[PDB]
Structures are given as C-alpha cells and as structure tokens.
Amino acid sequence: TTIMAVQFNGGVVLGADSRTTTGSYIANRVTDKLTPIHDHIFCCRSGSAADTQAVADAVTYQLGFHSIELNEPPLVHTAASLFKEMCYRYREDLMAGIIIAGWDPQEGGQVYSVPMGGMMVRQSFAIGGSGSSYIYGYVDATYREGMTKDECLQFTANALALAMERDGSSGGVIRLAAIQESGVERQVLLGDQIPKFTIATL
Template sequence: MKTNKNQMDLEMNLNAPHSMGTTIIGVTYNGGVVLGADSRTSTGMYVANRASDKITQLTDNVYVCRSGSINLSFASTHLTLLFYLGFLAADSQIVSDYVRYFLHQHTIQLGQSATSKVAANLIRLLSYNNKKMLETGLIVGGWDKYEGGKIYAIPLGGTLIEQPFAIGGSGSSYLYGFFDQAWKEGMTKDEAEQLVVKAVSLAIARDGASGGVVRTVIINSEGVTRNFYPGDKLQLWHEELEPQNSLLDLLNSSNPEPMNI
C-alpha cells in the first residue's frame, strides 16, 4: 500500500506544472541596465531543467526576465501558438512570444526599434487583460535614445511600475533588505553587474526554487552583452558547502566532515 502511495506521489510530482520559481533582477546604472536570473526550472519537487535561460530578447535593445508557471486554463486557449512553438510553454514564454511578434510589427511600421516603455506597456496590457488566467511576473529592461536605460516591473495582476531596480520570483523575498543596503545611485556597469551576480547567488543559497547558473544581460548605447557565471564559480554564503563532482568525493576525502541536515 505504501509503495502505491509513493508511486502516486511520484507521478503527481512528475506531472506537476513547470514552475519558474526563480530569482530575476533588473538594475539601472549610469549608462544602461543590467538584467540577471538564475537557471532552475522545477516540476513539482523535481528540477526539470537546471540551465534554462530566463532572460528573453524582445527587440534589439529590450529584454525581459521571466518568472511564473504554467496555467493550463490559459494554455488551453492558446493551443495554436503552443503547437507552433512545439512544446508546452510557461505563461511567461507565451506572453514573451506574443509581445515579440507585436513589437516586430511595430518596428516594421515605424522603421525603428520599440522603446522599453512600449514593450513594458504591451506586456502590462496582456497581463492585465488575462490576470485571471496568467501566473507570471516579469521585469522588462532596455535602453533607447529617448530615455536611456529603464527598468519596468510587471508583477502578477498586470501592474506596471518603473523602478531604478526590480527583483522578482521566489528568491526575491530574501533580497529586499540586501538591495535596500547595497543599491546606490550612479553605479558603473561593473558595479551593477557585480551587484546582480552577488544578489542572485545569495538567493540561490537561501531559496530552494532558485539554483543552477547565473546569466546576465547588459544593455546600453553600445549594444547588448550577455555573460554566464557557472554555479561552481559563484560566491559561497554562510554554511554552504564547496562544490563537489559527486557525493563520493565527500565520502572518499581524507578528512570527511559530517554533513549538517
């Protein structure tokens, strides 16, 4: 009987919606913006993808950080798009694909790329009009010649908030106090990226739904730069263990230390 129950629990977790329980961050600096995110995608209690890319390009100069999960009632009304994509996507992926399509049409009509404000307002419109079905929060960041670098947060429900920095996802609850102390006006590009990487690594250490690697996107007048920080190169925090190739490395070490559980 216990075996059957365990098997049922296993099947329920394997069939659970893909969750983007995550950490996403957007920061403005003196000249542009830096976006950052972890890479863990979970299905129930299992890690479905440990190296997913949660920062999606919308235009040449605007990107969006995605968090959320699959809402099957919303997905069922968009089967044509999902069939075209070839896979069952999270809510945030569906919204991003719609927005990228509309912004492409916008660029053709106007002969220039859309601003980050236009992209953020389009996401806000889709999120608000589908607020009863969508389970997603997004951070839009970009640079344009009119307003420079801008960060917009569109949390669950479709509110649009322009902020000097924005954090979202399950890992954000561990970062509010950290950002209140660490963020400052007029940071350089390197200072802003270091802050983003440090913050994501801190969330990874505390939040079970965040993990993997850290990806960053830097957007300014010179263009876009994408950087990658593997998990074994991230800063370790209180009581974190050094990365190991496997559990056997710990057991076979000359002076194994007990693992605190």
C-alpha cells in the first residue's frame, strides 16, 4: 500500500494504489483506498483493511452528525482530530495509518498525516503505506513550493508509479483525486497512462 497527498493553492491532491494482498496473493487488484469523509474531506487508507474501514466509517458518522448540528461545513482539522482520537484511543488494536486531506473555507487545502501511533501532524505533502519507503528520496528532491493543481497531479502520479514498481504490496491502477472549493475531481490512471521509467540495461 502506497498513499500520497499534496496541497496547493486551491486545495489538495490525493492518490493511491489499488492492490490488496494477503501474503503473495492479490485479493483485490482494483481497490479504492481513497474514502470520502465529507463533501470536501477525503482520507487515504493504509495498514489493515478492516481497521481503517471501521475507523473511516465511525469518523464519517460523527463528522456528518457534527456538521448538521453546527449547520456549517466541517473543518478539515476537525476530521483529522476525530481520526486522531480514535487511532490513539485504540492504538493497541487498530493498525491504521490515515492521511486526511481536504478543503474548507477557513483554512483552504490542508493535508494531515495521522500515523500508526495516533499522532497528528500537518504537512505540505504526506506519504504513507509500505511502498512509501522507496519514494522518500524522490519526493524530497522533486517537490517544490508553488506547484499548481495540475503539477501536483503529475508529481503525485509519478511518485505513486515509482513506488508501485518497487513494492510487492503496491500495484494495480492509480486513483487520483483533486479537492477544491468547487468539488472533487476523481480520475484513474490505467495501464498505459501510468508514468513509465526505463530500466537500466546492459
């Protein structure tokens, strides 16, 4: 599993792989690891499929009820705070690394990383999953401030592709998402659309 979220002026750009494996067997090759918490709040999921699905469900139930009582669009930081609370409270059982990303009128496009322990840190871009180890040096040398919405989409696709080619637990297709004040822009990059990188030959 490889998830990534980058932020720009308008909002954020989420992306992930679609491989769900059990040992060396791929149970699902077209998994959707990008779950919508609210209208402009999404979350990438990594770790345990049942743990992250139960946590994402709970947060979605709470955030929607909270948004109705307040009669206001929920803040991205509040969604991150609800994920953080559950992931810390049940840190011994749950095995989930959630990246929360979205857009709100008070703070714009924000990306929050909520790793395994249950801490919560805001970043300009974040990467998680088992395949994220292979792309730490690339996102460090390639990311620059002032990227546009389209540049974030290419940068995210390039990083996910590099990780998918090296990680055994990553693969499939790339599912991107662009969140803005407007709405969400979901898009899949299949086989040939996936950015390619030549292999050193002799």
